[PDB]
Amino acid sequence: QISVRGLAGVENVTELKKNFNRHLHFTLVKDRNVATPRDYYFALAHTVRDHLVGRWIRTQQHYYEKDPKRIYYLSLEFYMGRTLQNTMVNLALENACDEATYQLGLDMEELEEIEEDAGLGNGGLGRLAACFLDSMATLGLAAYGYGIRYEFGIFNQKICGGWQMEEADDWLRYGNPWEKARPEFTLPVHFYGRVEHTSQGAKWVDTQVVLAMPYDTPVPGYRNNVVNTMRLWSAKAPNDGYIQAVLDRNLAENISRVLYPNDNFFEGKELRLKQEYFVVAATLQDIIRRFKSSTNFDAFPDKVAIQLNDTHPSLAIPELMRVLVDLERLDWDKAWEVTVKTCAYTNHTVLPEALERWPVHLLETLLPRHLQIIYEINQRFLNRVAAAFPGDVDRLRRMSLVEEGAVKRINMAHLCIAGSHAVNGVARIHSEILKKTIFKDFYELEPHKFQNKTNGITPRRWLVLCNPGLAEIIAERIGEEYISDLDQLRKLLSYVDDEAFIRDVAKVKQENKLKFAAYLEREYKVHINPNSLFDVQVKRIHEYKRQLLNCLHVITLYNRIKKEPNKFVVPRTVMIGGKAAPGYHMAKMIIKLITAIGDVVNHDPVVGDRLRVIFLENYRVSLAEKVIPAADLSEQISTAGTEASGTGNMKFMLNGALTIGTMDGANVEMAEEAGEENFFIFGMRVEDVDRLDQRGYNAQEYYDRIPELRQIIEQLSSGFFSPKQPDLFKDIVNMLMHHDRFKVFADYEEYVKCQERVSALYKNPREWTRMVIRNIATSGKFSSDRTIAQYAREIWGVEPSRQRLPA
Amino acid sequence: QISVRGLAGVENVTELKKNFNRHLHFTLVKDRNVATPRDYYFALAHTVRDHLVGRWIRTQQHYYEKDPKRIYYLSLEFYMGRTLQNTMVNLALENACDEATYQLGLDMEELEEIEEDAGLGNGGLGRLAACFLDSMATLGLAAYGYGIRYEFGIFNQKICGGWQMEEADDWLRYGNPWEKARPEFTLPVHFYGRVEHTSQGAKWVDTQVVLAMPYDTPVPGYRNNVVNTMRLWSAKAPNDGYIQAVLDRNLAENISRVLYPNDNFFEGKELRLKQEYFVVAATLQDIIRRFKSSTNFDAFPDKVAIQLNDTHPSLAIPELMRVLVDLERLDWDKAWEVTVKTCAYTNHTVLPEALERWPVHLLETLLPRHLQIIYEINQRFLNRVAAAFPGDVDRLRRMSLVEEGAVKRINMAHLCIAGSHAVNGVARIHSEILKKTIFKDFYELEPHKFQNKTNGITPRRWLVLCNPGLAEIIAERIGEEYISDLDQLRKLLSYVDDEAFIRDVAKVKQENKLKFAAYLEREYKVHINPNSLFDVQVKRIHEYKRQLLNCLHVITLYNRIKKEPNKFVVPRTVMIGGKAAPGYHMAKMIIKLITAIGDVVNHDPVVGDRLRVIFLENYRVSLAEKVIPAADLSEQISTAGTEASGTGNMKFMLNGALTIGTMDGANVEMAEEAGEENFFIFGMRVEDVDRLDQRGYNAQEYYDRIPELRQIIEQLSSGFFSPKQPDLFKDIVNMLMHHDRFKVFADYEEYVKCQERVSALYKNPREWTRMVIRNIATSGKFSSDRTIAQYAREIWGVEPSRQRLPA
Ligand SMILES: O=C(COc1ccc(-c2ccccc2)cc1)N[C@@H]1O[C@H](CO)[C@@H](O)[C@H](O)[C@H]1O
Numbered sequence A, B: 001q002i003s004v005r006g007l008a009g010v011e012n013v014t015e016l017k018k019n020f021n022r023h024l025h026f027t028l029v030k031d032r033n034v035a036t037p038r039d040y041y042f043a044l045a046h047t048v049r050d051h052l053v054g055r056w057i058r059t060q061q062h063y064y065e066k067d068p069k070r071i072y073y074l075s076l077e078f079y080m081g082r083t084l085q086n087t088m089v090n091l092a093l094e095n096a097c098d099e100a101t102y103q104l105g106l107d108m109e110e111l112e113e114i115e116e117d118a119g120l121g122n123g124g125l126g127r128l129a130a131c132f133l134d135s136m137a138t139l140g141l142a143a144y145g146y147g148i149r150y151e152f153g154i155f156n157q158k159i160c161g162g163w164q165m166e167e168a169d170d171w172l173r174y175g176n177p178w179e180k181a182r183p184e185f186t187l188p189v190h191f192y193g194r195v196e197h198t199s200q201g202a203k204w205v206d207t208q209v210v211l212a213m214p215y216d217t218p219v220p221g222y223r224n225n226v227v228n229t230m231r232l233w234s235a236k237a238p239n240d241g242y243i244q245a246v247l248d249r250n251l252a253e254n255i256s257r258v259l260y261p262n263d264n265f266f267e268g269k270e271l272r273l274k275q276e277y278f279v280v281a282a283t284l285q286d287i288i289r290r291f292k293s294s295t296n297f298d299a300f301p302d303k304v305a306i307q308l309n310d311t312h313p314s315l316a317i318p319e320l321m322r323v324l325v326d327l328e329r330l331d332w333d334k335a336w337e338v339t340v341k342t343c344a345y346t347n348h349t350v351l352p353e354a355l356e357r358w359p360v361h362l363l364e365t366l367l368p369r370h371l372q373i374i375y376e377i378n379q380r381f382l383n384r385v386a387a388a389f390p391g392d393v394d395r396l397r398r399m400s401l402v403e404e405g406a407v408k409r410i411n412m413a414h415l416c417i418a419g420s421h422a423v424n425g426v427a428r429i430h431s432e433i434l435k436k437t438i439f440k441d442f443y444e445l446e447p448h449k450f451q452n453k454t455n456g457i458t459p460r461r462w463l464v465l466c467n468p469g470l471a472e473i474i475a476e477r478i479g480e481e482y483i484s485d486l487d488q489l490r491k492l493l494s495y496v497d498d499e500a501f502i503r504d505v506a507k508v509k510q511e512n513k514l515k516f517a518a519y520l521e522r523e524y525k526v527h528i529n530p531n532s533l534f535d536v537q538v539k540r541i542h543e544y545k546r547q548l549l550n551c552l553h554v555i556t557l558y559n560r561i562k563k564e565p566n567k568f569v570v571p572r573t574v575m576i577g578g579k580a581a582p583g584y585h586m587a588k589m590i591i592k593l594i595t596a597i598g599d600v601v602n603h604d605p606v607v608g609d610r611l612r613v614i615f616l617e618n619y620r621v622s623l624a625e626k627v628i629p630a631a632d633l634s635e636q637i638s639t640a641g642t643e644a645s646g647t648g649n650m651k652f653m654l655n656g657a658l659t660i661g662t663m664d665g666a667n668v669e670m671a672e673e674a675g676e677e678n679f680f681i682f683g684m685r686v687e688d689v690d691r692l693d694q695r696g697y698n699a700q701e702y703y704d705r706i707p708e709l710r711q712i713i714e715q716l717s718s719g720f721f722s723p724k725q726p727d728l729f730k731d732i733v734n735m736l737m738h739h740d741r742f743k744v745f746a747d748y749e750e751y752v753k754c755q756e757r758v759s760a761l762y763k764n765p766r767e768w769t770r771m772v773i774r775n776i777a778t779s780g781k782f783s784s785d786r787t788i789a790q791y792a793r794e795i796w797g798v799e800p801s802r803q804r805l806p807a
């Protein structure tokens, strides 16, 4: 049908048809009389997976023969989403499968909706790992993702009476056709026990053992016949009343049972520490085993890079030291040099409550040898600080890996900086904040360690897969090369005055919106107007992300309409979606407020279809692929200095939405790429926030001086949005008035004014679309291929390649 | 190589070779460079499984079109063993796979040793279910086995310092290529809750729900293209702190976690009751759903038979009543008629401590509605007893389903007799004991219910598979037909004086023994003499089975040798094997005594290789397939009246061992088939045991009058077999002397005399072999094809068929 989806040759179609019938018969043990749509999905999945295997085997054989430096990306999260369509895209099989299934009397799109998301992450950090794997394979790097095979991923969110309810994400129920169990590569992981000292050095003895069983999933590059591996570890009890002893095997296997969903506010839970060590200990044994199959650990950093995705796998540092010192018997200083040259650390936040700080008593009991090593690392590090800054005793206390207080804690960020040759933030402003404020002491001691690597997204999933219509009108003008060289989109700047292109860009957006409006009714019985501006904010629910500020705007618009009902306003559909961490009361209250506003707004006859407020239930990778192509306006409105990068912002820019946002995270670089005239920037900059903090933020001042704001607060307090429970929202009002760390009121006026400018532009479709073209055309920087090429050259010491492997 | 293993045609071999390479590549994702022997096993298993699928689909389609009466065999145990070789045998693929693998440079026998036993049973009752499934498929019955998919089967037994140690049988670790998950056929099972009464009748409300997920395994008939199903249920939590709630899903899924290994002494454990209801509730919903796919439950017994394998699934009776009365709204009397006509019950013991008697308080809490129904069944039944036997108030108390006492209990055997149209024992003497003693009252009320169905074994696994050499020398003389018509073995009576046949029978036995002697060294570093008489007792360890009596004989022989070392004796290798239930102290002590005797006997220079005592570790289906073909003498020495049938006895008879045994269980019918002159019968009959009980058994009398017996007891008491712990065996001596329910001393003299007659005959190889021929030739009765034909005609009301389905 469309060019970018590939060829549908007679030979290929015929072959796909027979392999499909073969799998339906031999694999599923069904015939056409009893097969359900799920059986058809599986027959298709196995058919496509068969095309991966030859390339997977030869890629791995290739790395063995050529022995390149290997990249190990350690993450506790891989937010993969669905795999079927992505695999077809990357193997150029999409049109052929479409044709083949069509001939068999099946709708491929319908079969695609059957696949469960692999929801093995919370949000941005987990999805970054997934984009990164795609880019590493597309750039021909010998790269391995290592993580945990959680039995239950991020919870499914249901909304009941306006409230979030959580249910278990039982994503493996029907089986996973993409993974291959490797029970033969099983490895032991140790816990508890005690440390004995001999003449020969230290020994860790009397440990309990959990087995780590690997499951491999193929990661295909974009049309280069490269297929890399993501290896996910699963916990198994070793084989040694009788009944109860058997049932107690559950205790061990609980390590890989469920993903922790609390992506704000760190809590030191023992089971999470076990997960963190488990992935690290099994991964490092695998790495070392592979390195030996090439005595001389001097060459170890020439053949191994380990990237730590935040501090979650930070135990890699003392575990690598443990193995080199206790098992391989290297002297400390040589082991340390190897470790530092091997490890690099990516930081993802600045909120103090988000940093991992493990109580010493937990490590003492669970990992007694690791605690000794961390103490030794700390002593040697602080000796270096003392020599560089003699007499500065407060610096010594600020930089220590060990924090004193009620309970002594280990600061895992400080461990990571001490034991890595490179530390990076995820956007230019974030990396600068790291050097200037939270890791200032570390930067002064070792300035060469600190880098920036601005985040990106893969244009395969986030353009070609989710928005084929847009990908096609672009390919028509500039060819197909841009799909793996996104900087080529700049060529589109010469079409900004092209009448045909303007019309096509606008037509694709209209089609995406009609499709999404239809999805909403069929699957959720909700009525929307497709001619309205689609105003969307989708991301995890956090105070810093300021869903609340968006709420205030929605109510302002509603109040204005009620005040002057016969005045024309640009119609809007305001959609907000995102999950709240189960323990986060304020985030759960924000969800309830959103639905409560909807209840009032959506049923007010005076409003009509001029304003609609919808809460997008169960936001996840598959839903983002649907809503992002349909968006006109992207809400990126975190308080300046709080969102380290953002990546959802990039997805929207690539797909033809305009952005309203603060100068925060990657928004700054996006505005710089597109030109500030083509971006809706508002609000305090980081400097303005600092000045407010120096003086003291008083929310009352805003309430006193802004009549429209005072009206919203009275409506909330008095029960306008909760008639049967008038004080339902008192916690929200109280926080806004007295303890708002994120200064919601301070940006309110500028935000409302800026939103008026959005509505003005949307009235002029031709000029709206021309601004959209200038955004799409300057989105090239934010390809994760650019990000990974910078990691490879500036951190890993390896050269990317665009060359094909033989097919 | 050998005729009965089938054809190896050029077309077949070539096709098997390519499908093997296809599975190795696409299924396992390996090539020849990294493949382990386990990968080769799996490639072969998937290749053979592919041959089943077409026949499996068409068999099930056939039953749908023809709508025959369906047989549902409900068992908590299916002791299946390995599947690969059995599937090849039944599909006539054995020689072809052998050739194909040989050409690929592989040894098929070696690949066969890689497969885990499906050890989903304890011993005889579980293995009977497995033989029965094979016979039902071979006889063309529309039959379904229904059970539980245990994650952990019968424990692996290790012997450490002479003691049994139990380890988890993690049989699913590497995956099971034979099963197909059917997540779409998942069904809810209810527990706990309470009973509400309306106008409409009773309602069971506020229940907790566990899901039952089915896994189907194909059951191939012998060369008839019939493939039936064994459906095994697995427990899954329904989908509705957060972390802990996720981890608590284990509680629900524990129902199908582990097989209970205590096959003597019933213990009322709540988790076992849940297992019993779980299999019954899910199975009956499946049965009813299938019946509806044909209002009129009158025809239900014309289209459904349910066979209960002991009382373990006895809850089928009140569950069927519950469904018909509460859900389908049938009146009680009509529902009851349907139930009785549908259900039949097979009894497997006479030991009072083995009968299931569930405490009422357990049923009250777990299954409140079932307890009401059982009470109602009991009231109506006892009303019938009172009318038939007016004034006999003690009969009323003896026959009640409810037993009074400390705790009130339900007698599940009484429930089963009341709610079944047929009750059978498993050997002629057992069925007679049922009518005359333990169920006498029930027989007097309803004599037409009571039947005999003498047990059998499948000659496919138990001759063709495990002893191809013997199968071949038989096929040479009489053709291949006997494999599915075992009565044809009688034709062998005309070869009893045939010199060539005598030599061939003896040669096959010698080859089996050389092979087994070699297996022992290679896998267990133990040295045996292959010219000795192989004296074997393999079966679960129980006092009633009298491994202890065998122990006394072994010590007698040892004492005799020590007494007269230069006198010739027929050399023996005495092998004893079997698992003890984890809670059974005396059985664990018997295992230790056996190894302790071995320690002394096997290292005494005076003995030489004239006597060896070996404990066969980890006895299970795969080991029985090795040791049974190698045996000369089969020990079947239970106290008269205690072994309901035995089936191991039949396996030995079919494979060329002679039998030393009591007139107990099926031994009686075996001796009757072969002629008593061709059997080594000794000891008390049931009548002699009764007379002893009337007078009172005094073990001291035997000890006083038998000097050789007194010597053994002093050796045991004084520490001759346990030098470092002189009183190790005091419990054994104490039991023998003071509380032996199984009268070990009373049979001792006759047993020793009889064993002398065995040794005399073995000295004359020609006459030994002629007696063997007369045993093999009269073993036809004990084919499970005969047993199943009698069940089908006399209980299920269906006609077996030997006709092929189209291929
Ligand atoms: O997604 C995250 C953080 O997610 C988690 C996920 C899990 C945890 C966690 C930590 C300890 C224990 C349990 C859970 C903490 C944070 N951060 C985002 O990372 C993106 C990629 O760099 C950035 O674009 C976002 O700005 C940043 O908020």
Ligand SMILES: O=C(COc1ccc(-c2ccccc2)cc1)N[C@@H]1O[C@H](CO)[C@@H](O)[C@H](O)[C@H]1O
Pocket (backbone or CB within 6 Å): B122, B123, B124, B125, B126, B128, B260, B261, B262, B263, B264, B266, B267, B272, B348, B349, B356, B426, B455, B643, B644, B645, B646, B647, B665
């Ligand atoms: O194997 C058995 C009994 O096995 C079990 C297995 C499990 C249980 C059980 C019962 C309740 C709770 C837990 C376990 C009780 C008995 N009996 C044998 O059945 C054979 C087949 O009919 C006969 O040949 C044997 O004589 C008989 O002992």
